[PDB]
Amino acid sequence: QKGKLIQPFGCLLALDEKTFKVIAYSENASELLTMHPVLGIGTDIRSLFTAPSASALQKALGFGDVSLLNPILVHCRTSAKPFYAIIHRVTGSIIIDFEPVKPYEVPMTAAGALQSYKLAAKAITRLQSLPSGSMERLCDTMVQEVFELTGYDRVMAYKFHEDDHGEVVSEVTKPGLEPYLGLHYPATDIPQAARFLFMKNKVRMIVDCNAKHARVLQDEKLSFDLTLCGSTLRAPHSCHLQYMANMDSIASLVMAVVVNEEDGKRKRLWGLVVCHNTTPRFVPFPLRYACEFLAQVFAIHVNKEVELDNQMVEKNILRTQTLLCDMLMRDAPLGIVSQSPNIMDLVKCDGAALLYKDKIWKLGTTPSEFHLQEIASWLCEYHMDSTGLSTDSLHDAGFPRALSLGDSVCGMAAVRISSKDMIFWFRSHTAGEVRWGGAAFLEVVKTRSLPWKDYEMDAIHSLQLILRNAFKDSDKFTRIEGDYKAIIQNPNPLIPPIFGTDEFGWCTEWNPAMSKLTGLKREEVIDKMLLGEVFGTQKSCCRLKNQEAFVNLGIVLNNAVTSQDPEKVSFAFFTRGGKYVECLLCVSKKLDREGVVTGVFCFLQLASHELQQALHVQRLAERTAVKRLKALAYIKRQIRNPLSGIMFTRKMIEGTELGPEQRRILQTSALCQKQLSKILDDSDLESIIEGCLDLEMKEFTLNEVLTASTSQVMMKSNGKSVRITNETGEEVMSDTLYGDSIRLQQVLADFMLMAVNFTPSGGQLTVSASLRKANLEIRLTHTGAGIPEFLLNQMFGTEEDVSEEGLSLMVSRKLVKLMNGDVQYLRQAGKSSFIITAELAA
Amino acid sequence: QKGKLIQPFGCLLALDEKTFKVIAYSENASELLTMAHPVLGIGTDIRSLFTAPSASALQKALGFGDVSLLNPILVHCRTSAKPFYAIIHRVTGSIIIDFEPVKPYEVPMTAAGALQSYKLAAKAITRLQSLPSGSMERLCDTMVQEVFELTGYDRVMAYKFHEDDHGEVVSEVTKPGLEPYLGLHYPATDIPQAARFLFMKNKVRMIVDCNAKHARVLQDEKLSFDLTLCGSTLRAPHSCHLQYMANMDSIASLVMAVVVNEEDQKRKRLWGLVVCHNTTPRFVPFPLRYACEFLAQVFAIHVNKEVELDNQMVEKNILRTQTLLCDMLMRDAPLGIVSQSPNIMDLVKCDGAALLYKDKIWKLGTTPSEFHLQEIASWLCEYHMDSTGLSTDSLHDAGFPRALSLGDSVCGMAAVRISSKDMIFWFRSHTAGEVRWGGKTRSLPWKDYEMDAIHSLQLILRNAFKDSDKFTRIEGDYKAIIQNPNPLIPPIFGTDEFGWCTEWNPAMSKLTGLKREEVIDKMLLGEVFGTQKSCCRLKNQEAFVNLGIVLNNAVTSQDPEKVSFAFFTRGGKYVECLLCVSKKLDREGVVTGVFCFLQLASHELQQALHVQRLAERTAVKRLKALAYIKRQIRNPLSGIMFTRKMIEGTELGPEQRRILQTSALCQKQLSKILDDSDLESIIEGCLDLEMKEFTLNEVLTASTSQVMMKSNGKSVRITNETGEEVMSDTLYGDSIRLQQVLADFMLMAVNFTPSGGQLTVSASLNLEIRLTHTGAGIPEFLLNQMFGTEEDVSEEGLSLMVSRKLVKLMNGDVQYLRQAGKSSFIITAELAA
């Protein structure tokens, strides 16, 4: 922080807060500024520059927060050399850094901050337009935009893990360089001092490494040593220089990403965005400022997308709760595997087994009954005081016959239902490969399975509890997964609140979870009418807020009596003492064995507010989507009807004898109607955009296509008085082609109709076709300026969304791509040419 | 309320709260319950006239806490069978038990409690719940239709109370052959306030027969207080309802009550009644009455919801007026607003705009003559000295000397003075007003926020001119009710290109608590709006970054955008609103900063737009796919049109010409149906119809050509038997939509028909078209879908619903008639010949 060496592309001056006189100066500063006022201790600052520059600098030092006006434009007194001045406040002193102003780009008058921030107005918009839910897309977009703005050769999205070991997540380099994606790096490349330094100043630049750095002339009479930690000209340290030495890079630009995560707010370094170049380069301060702002935006976005993945766990927990509630109705024996929701959906796995009275059931990939007997015997004999176990890899646990099992089963999770009854879940082997570069060593994770999370064990234990209670009517788990001997622990049940009533309305079920959630003892509440006594506005144990809640509860119960499916509704009630519980009620029928309705069975689902709002938004979106789909189907039918009408009328007209030229005109109309029926037959363009398509195989000739297109277009062409000519040879005509004719006619007609529309009044258009032995090349040459550049760019498929005409162009290009061809646009003096390539069978 | 007379269809008993002995009774009880026994006298026990389980149930009910839960207690008499309901009420110092006979023709023990009783109305509640919001008349008509279907009474009416207690019939449903009173107002004296309070206390009242003889109640003389039968369901009318029934020609009555909770606990007001009248005596079981009482609660909830939605719509409208009141400071000179398209005609709802400025008169829309405007200004400057504005909806009543000569084209005038010579007029048009009572143009009166908007426009224009209070008396039949409208100018702050503050209007000073002098000449980011050492403290980093982003985007982009904003003021109050930004382009065309204003929005409205925007962001491709399809429609249509032209380009015969013209008719049909989607055409004003000459022969031929294909597919023959006299006659009206309607009607007739069936077409001229097809006929549930009874509609039924609504737009109805092997579709409409 006190290294007295600075880079030579700029100069530094350290002054006092009160005297405004130069104390610390650099050797190159005297040369650059005086290129006469001798730069030295006790010299003023105004005389080195002109009067307006001195006034601006003095006002800047007089400001409260100089960081808002950091890039200042100043002029040297002699020859008016432009310079960028940056002000920074060290304890008891002001440090100003001056850099030369190359032509480059200049903001309006003084750059300030907002104008500099304006330089990154496109990358911010592109980042804010991405659909949420995919961190990799965000990383790729940020890296690409940083590459575009900075212009450095290589851009990397180095990421920090919990053990501070790096992992590149993306990279975009110029062609002709070694990719670095996926290469892990050790924790000694970046010392913790570097991270601490980056936590303070977010952007660091090293313009060149093999350059002689000047020194400073810090005053001897100063009572404190100057700190160069905050200055942007501080010379790189040897340890940091070793990084570029091992990375064969010269110019570096490192931008920290700082997120704010709530205390378990505390700051955290999500990673870095590193830029490298093989040759030295320098960029103006506004570009660095804009890059820092863009990094702030990216940090905000990543912090937002972490919270969205924090909700998938809650959603899966709710789904498991629903499954557990559903499974409570089935009979204890064989009811575990009776219907579609078996114990495969309880925890993610590929094999399940239920040992009960020597009747081993199989549900998938699982060892033989012999091997299952052996593993059950081993678990019984070794782990006496273990109701349940979860082994990551059976080899590590110590199963003698784990070798004979093979690679099919690796992880195991077993529970003891009763003295002789047990349940097993098995997981197949997954191998992990980590490049682990910058070290390269290639570590192996041996034969291990995916870890068993907490809520999976919680669900398994809840299932065990349910089965034990059901069997009775008719707790420490050893987790040897980290090869750290026994880490036995106690899980928690995952039973949601439940209450059930008979047909009349008297309470009959009140489980301990509800007793804890409400605070009401079951003995206190049972044998009381559900509507009016347990839940009621006045004179009731649990006080509903309004009369609307009472009406809604009554409606929900009455509707649920009729319908078997469990409707999800909102619920809100006060507890015994002044607490407003807001949950999501689910009611289901209670059909008995014979099939007589006995009552209702209800359970709540406690959920955070964001999840409920997301569910509401999803419901609204699906309703809007179904309405739009119904409207589109209605329109399609109402257009299909007159389509059939005109088909039949054309058939009737063809029934009467007419001229051979009339016959040709009728045939051209027939091709037009077939094209119309085909385009109306398409369900939507989204399937075309996705890529899933089929092209029919049929015989055709070019005369039909050309005549259909000309008949389609020439009315509009003559609207602008446009001449159309055909130069295709008759030999190419006589040749017959094979493929999908309708797509070709529609695509070529659209392209050449756009050419007609772009044709100025009185222009000329020529159509030619060439057959090479087969390949067909189509040239459409129209007189005029042609399509503008932006529309030509919109024609390409790189853009996600374009104009309607641009969308038609993109769809035609995609169809040509599926037609193993290409589309080219050529501009010449007063001419524009479309070239279309196709490959078919002759 | 203390009347000792009861209706004869039930019986009454009274029990002491503690001793549980009978103290009052009725002769109907003597003739109905103990008939074949203990004497029904004072002090007689209760557990002797019923079976032991019945006595146990009665004892348990009496010992219960809240008896009003399990009211319809079915009880078996001591004699064999003879069921009876046992409704119970707790009155001061007694418990009153009413028995009503259970007729076994219906309801064989289908309800024994409140929860089971409420089940009978599940279908009605489901139908009411899923209706789209924003239409009171639809809710009322559905509600009364459901009442009619559930109860089966002859006449059902929704009777809405106004502020002056005088009622208005909003809807009504009756069996055919009955005189309607729809829309007829009634005096407030028909229903006394005592009846209103009684309805507020007892939600449902039933009078089975007005002519039935009432029976007395024998009560002990030893009690110190008389028994009150006000809460009992067995009470006799006190001649107040007898006269009402005689006047309305009714014999039986079932009258409910609608109670709505309105904010100042919130008060409860009787929004109206749902009255059922019958010409013959009728009896409904207690569960049906109990369910009809439950339906009223859902109806009241929905009515309150619709009222809140209307209030939010009003707030959105005033927000829009506030937004459009801006963009007039930017425009230079008074002529600038007149020249531009969003003119002063859009500031307030008017049919004519006039501006008098320096001997120049600028007029827009329906406006009087120049001499008329000059004489209006002369009158206003000659009779009104100190006024800054005038307002009236009837200029004739205003006292204009030549108001009658001005005609009915313009009636209401609102005028505001800008300078000593320049001033502004807003004029309205003719409105139709009819009021009925069961016992020169008037235009809608000017509201208050309209006056506020006009006053703020006056302030803006006078400020701009300088840079270069007023009485309404027509809302009532009075004179010179002076008012002082307040302005509607939103808070405004504006900065230059560097970021320093430049303009900070007083509204922002009031809202945020700061002052103009202490904030001016400071950077907008960091100094004013900042997380630290700032006047207005932002919440966290995200707000700062978002504000910077929106400022930069506003500078770069060209259109205003709305972004949520939230900050702490200097007094600790958390303000949340919407921020709108715009570029402050100079006359030359170079940006010189930004101009921003806040739109303080209500919490419900603000949160009703976040979810809307979030849902909008989900659908992107499908929104523009419709426009893409609409634009790409033209090319195949142009191709088919030009192919038709070339087909015409040679020699043709008579039949060939006819079939070509039929094809062309279908061609225009396809063109105009693909040109516009028309959405649902819910409003009759929308979907303007082309009206041109046509003949019926072409229409019929074009309609049957589209379906001959399917007819020959099933080998179904179609015959047209309309006479040549009707065919030769020419009508002036819409044709092609009639072609489509006829075509899809015969298409549906072909569907669901056996092969070899006969289809017959007839027309009578009022145009009536009858299409009779032989076979089994269309299934009933399809007709239920097409009539709108079933909310869920199939794709095939949607076309029939569209055709029915189109026929209704032609002021007609579609009729389905069923006979042995015959189904007849009758379409009726009118045109000009």
Numbering used by the authors:
A (entry chain A): 75 to 109, 120 to 348, 361 to 535, 556 to 590, 743 to 1041, 1051 to 1119
B (entry chain B): 75 to 110, 120 to 347, 360 to 534, 562 to 590, 743 to 1039, 1052 to 1119
From the paper:
Structural comparison of apo-AtphyA and AtphyA-Pr revealed that they share a highly similar homodimeric structure. However, notable differences were found around the PΦB-binding cradle. Tyr327 of apo-phyA helix-α5 can cause obvious steric clash with the D ring of PΦB. Nonetheless, this contact is probably abolished in apo-AtphyA, as a closer location of GAF helix-α5 might cause substantial steric clashes with the PRSSF motif. Thus, the portion downstream of the WGG motif in the PHY tongue of apo-phyA becomes more disordered than that of phyA-Pr, facilitating the entrance of PΦB to its pocket. Size-exclusion chromatography assays demonstrated that PΦB-free phyA (apo-phyA) and Pr conformer of phyA (phyA-Pr) have a similar molecular weight of ~250 kDa.
Phytochromes (phys), first discovered in plants, are red and far-red photoreceptors that are also widely found in bacteria and fungi later. In higher plants, phys share a conserved domain structure consisting of an N-terminal photosensory module (PSM) followed by two tandem Period/ARNT/Singleminded (PAS) domains, and a C-terminal histidine kinase-related domain (HKRD).
